[PDB]
A paper describes a structure:
Diphtheria toxin (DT) is secreted by Corynebacterium and causes disease in humans by inhibiting protein synthesis. DT consists of three domains—receptor (R-), translocation (T-), and catalytic (C-)—and similar to many other A-B toxins it enters the cell via the endosomal pathway. After the binding of the R-domain to the EGFR-like receptor on the cell surface, the toxin is endocytosed into the cell, and acidification inside the endosome promotes the requisite conformational change and membrane insertion of the T-domain followed by the translocation of the C-domain into the cytosol. Following translocation, the C-domain is proteolyzed from the R and T domains and proceeds to inhibit the EF2 translation factor, leading to the termination of protein synthesis and cell death.
DT was crystallized under varying buffer conditions in an effort to determine if conformational changes, particularly in the T-domain, are observed with a decreasing pH. Since the crystallization conditions were identical except for the buffer, the crystals of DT-5.0, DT-5.5, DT-6.0, and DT-7.0 have similar unit cell dimensions and diffraction resolutions. However, the α-angle for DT-5.0 is approximately 4° larger than that of other crystals. The structures of DT at various pH values were superimposed onto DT-5.0 using GESAMT in order to compare their similarities/differences. Overall, all of the structures are very similar, with RMSD deviations between the Cα atoms of 0.34 Å (997 residues, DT-5.5), 0.38 Å (999 residues, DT-6.0), and 0.41 Å (1000 residues, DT-7.0). Interestingly, the residues between H223 to P234, which span TH2, appear to become more flexible at a lower pH. In the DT-5.0 structure, the TH2 helix could be modelled in subunit A but not subunit B. It should be noted that this region does not form any crystal contacts that would cause conformational artifacts. In contrast, the long TH1, which is also expected to refold based on the latter studies, remains unchanged in the crystal structure even at pH 5. Surprisingly, the TH1 helix maintains its conformation in the crystal of the full-length toxin even at pH 5. We demonstrate that neither catalytic nor receptor-binding domains change their structure upon this acidification, while the T-domain undergoes a conformational change that results in the unfolding of TH2–3 helices.
Residue numbers in the entry:
A (entry chain B): 4 to 37, 47 to 187, 200 to 222, 225 to 227, 229 to 347, 354 to 516, 521 to 537
B (entry chain A): 5 to 38, 48 to 187, 200 to 347, 351 to 516, 522 to 537
């Protein structure tokens, strides 16, 4: 079966959102007008995802954003949700002429009778994207003539620089949320860059000619140290002083790498500058993004880091106008891209099937259901964790498992770990009443070409549902190699759910 | 709920059972018992049975017993199950949900309804994730009927350590690492004695503090010791084969040797089980083993004994600096030899490589994988479309994805440019796809893609087939989809390996 009934419905005045490119925002309000199987007018239930289609098609990296409009059908509309996007399959399980195109057939009187449940027309619904809870709607172009069109937002009307209007709109979705005023950041960035070209005048001690990569980097680390003494970078100096990602040597690497890929054709064209900078490593140094967090999350500190790296790029071009102009506009856009990724709902490492990457290991739950410990029944469950490592053989010392005195137990007979198919039994001992430690009975190593499947088996004695009160941890702790001695900790996060 | 494809009736059905030391002869006089799954266990694979043969009180370093072959007279039904939850099994097999599943399997009622005319039923389950073997679960009463022959007694081989067991398991592969550990043990002793008599060796042993020093000074000193020791004629191959791969550098031998000395106390040093347990949780053993980048590089007896001999000497030098040094040549060698055999056995076993099936590809801080096994298969022999999902993230700071290299076959297989896209934490990003040649298409995201801790992408590749003609090997150059990371001028290459399969 191909139609998801749980997601299909009829509704009066069905509304959705369409991301509109610049120059079409006014025109589209006068009516919706024009694979072939999927030729239709596209919309979404989520106005923020709509805004992602609004950017200039000739300059998708750096161009202006048009707007979003809300389209509405009068009367009754059937939303038919599909469990697949393979049309050949669809037409098969829906008995249609496998010759005629799907979105053509979708708009016919015959289709709307069979599937419309008495609505005036059908709209197809599909998952918008992997990792998204939004949907996309596919409208037959002729039926789409029935839509009235309202402006939800015109980004150019805001009259803001770059893509700030679009990204500021999207930050609305999250009310943690990076909601920065980029106007302020552009202004503070300008003033700090000029307030610093005025000790910083180590421009004398600079070769001012081509030199060697190691030489340029060396001099740029010194320049970075001197720059950070300036009081207009004082907070930056404080917040970048420990984390090795934010060290002057990484600012220097970044700046050097910018200098080598930016030629004159590139620097005069913002789209081309952004494409060039977008494929470099190291931007996390400038952005203050490390270990899953956006540390530079204030307008002032972002302006400092941008201001500092603008200066270093300036210094770095002679050794290997653009710095304060197109370099800043481009970097700002990439900041906005990454901040938006971190604002969107997303499973963190070790949750669901997202891998946990640490100390050279990669661990993950094998399937989503593996990461759920079901409750409310007596009996058994099994849960599979995949484990490998990037290069040389790294040991697995054991695993820490949650236990509930009397209501949840490790099944020490079915709990085991298998290394490239070799089944290894475990010896499990309670640490206390809430934690059991299981170690392999022979040595477990993983590495390139050597993986393991840890199979965790649980036994429930009570039909009683588990209460959060009862469980201390929310993760299974896999122990890596020993390195004050401690094991590398690899965390698989689970969720307690009722059977269903 | 029953896997008919894996179920069958067979005459003289046999299987293998690994047997602990002390039970190799007595088990042959009959299968006797010493709750849903209480039964006698066996496998179709005699080398996995060998895996169950090690002394239960010294599982890391203890002796291995043997394997016996058990056979049922007459007709046996192998009933293969698709799940291992007993409750699920009794329900869906409309049978008693009070009596233990395995006690029921030996009753006449069950044997009539599921035996297909055989005298007894044996349950069949997958042996383990990553294995093509099965385990058999035999009812204890019915197992009384089993005839038991000896397949191997590892003790009767009279070899040191667990050499006999691992040499047996190496047969399964006829690449295959099949080392003569007797030779290696002998060459190792010889080199250690021959290196202990060398002029510049002993000369560098005098420059030693021979006193507890700091860690860093122990490493500096052990690094010098390593360099000096490598000039000796008996380590000459090691000097050549360790000269360039930084994993095999003197500084990693020295960090290993220091880690050994720091965790080996006096009680540990005198017990092999406890030394193996301690040594088995250290990082860096790939340095001594010559294992890196998915390959066992030290794969000759001579080079393996050179690395172990050198490592033994360095541990001897590290013990005073950071509690008798006789550990270095007794239990340290015996223990490390066991760890070698464990890892060699892992590499000898069939296994999908990184980027094959759903095995992650880890490179340059990135992790990429096919989302599902079917994603990794480009099906052929039909006109139409397919979709393939690739997961992408990175370990810490934001790393870019510049594009993907996709295969094409002029006139038969093409990239569906409208369905191919990438999504970043749910943000959908269209791609611009251009052909490089008639065999390779490059697609770039239309907005910047970064991944890192907490930011993952889903690359969705869509193919369209214009012919129903099956794709021929002579048509596809590559066997991988090439995901390009950051630019260093060359891109970080992340490979996802696919297989071409007709339809099912």
């Amino acid at each position: 079966d191909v139609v998801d009934s749980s997601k299909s419905f009829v509704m009066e005045n069905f509304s959705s959102y369409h991301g509109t490119k610049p120059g079409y925002v006014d025109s589209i309000q006068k009516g919706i007008q024009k694979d072939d199987d999927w030729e239709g007018f596209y919309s979404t239930d989520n106005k923020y995802d709509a805004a992602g289609y609004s950017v200039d098609n000739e300059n998708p990296l750096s161009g202006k954003a048009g707007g979003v409009v809300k389209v509405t059908y009068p009367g009754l509309t059937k939303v038919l949700a599909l469990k697949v996007d393979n049309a050949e399959t669809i037409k098969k399980e829906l008995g249609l002429s496998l010759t005629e195109p799907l979105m053509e057939q979708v708009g016919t009187e015959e289709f709307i009778k069979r599937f419309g449940d008495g609505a005036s027309r059908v709209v197809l619904s599909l998952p918008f994207a992997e990792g998204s809870s939004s949907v996309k709607y596919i409208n037959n172009w002729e039926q789409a003539k029935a839509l009235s069109v309202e402006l939800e937002i015109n980004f150019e009307t805001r009259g803001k620089r770059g893509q700030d209007a679009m990204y500021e709109y999207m930050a609305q979705a999250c009310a943690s949320c990076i909601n920065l005023d980029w106007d302020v950041i552009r202004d503070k960035t300008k003033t700090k860059i000029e307030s610093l070209k005025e000790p910083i005048k180590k421009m004398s001690e600079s070769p001012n000619k081509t030199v060697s990569e190691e030489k340029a980097k060396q001099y740029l680390e010194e320049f970075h140290q001197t720059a950070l003494e300036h009081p207009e970078l004082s907070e930056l100096k404080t917040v970048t002083g420990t984390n090795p990602v934010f060290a002057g040597a990484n600012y220097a690497a970044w700046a050097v790498n910018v200098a080598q890929v930016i030629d004159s054709e590139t620097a005069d064209n913002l789209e081309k500058t952004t494409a060039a900078l977008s494929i470099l490593p190291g931007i996390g140094s400038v952005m203050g993004i490390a270990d899953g967090a956006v540390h530079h999350n204030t307008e002032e500190i972002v302006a400092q880091s941008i201001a500092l790296s603008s200066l270093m790029v300036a210094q770095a071009i002679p050794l290997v106008g653009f710095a304060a102009y197109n370099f800043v506009e481009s970097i700002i856009n990439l900041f906005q891209v990454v901040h938006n990724s971190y604002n969107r709902p997303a499973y963190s490492p070790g949750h669901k099937t997202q891998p946990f990457l640490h100390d050279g290991y990669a661990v993950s739950w094998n399937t989503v259901e593996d990461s759920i410990i079901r409750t409310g029944f007596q009996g058994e469950s099994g849960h599979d964790i995949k484990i490998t490592a990037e290069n040389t053989p790294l040991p697995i010392a054991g695993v820490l498992l949650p236990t509930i005195p009397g209501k949840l137990d490790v099944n020490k007979s079915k709990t085991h770990i298998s290394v490239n198919g070799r089944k290894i039994r475990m010896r499990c001992r309670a640490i206390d009443g809430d934690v059991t430690f299981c170690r392999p009975k022979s040595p477990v190593y993983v590495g390139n070409g050597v993986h393991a499947n840890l199979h965790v088996a649980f036994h429930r004695s009570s039909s009683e549902k588990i209460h959060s009160n009862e469980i201390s941890s929310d993760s299974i702790g896999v122990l890596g190699y020993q390195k004050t001695k401690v094991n590398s900790k690899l965390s698989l996060f689970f969720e307690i759910k009722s059977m269903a």
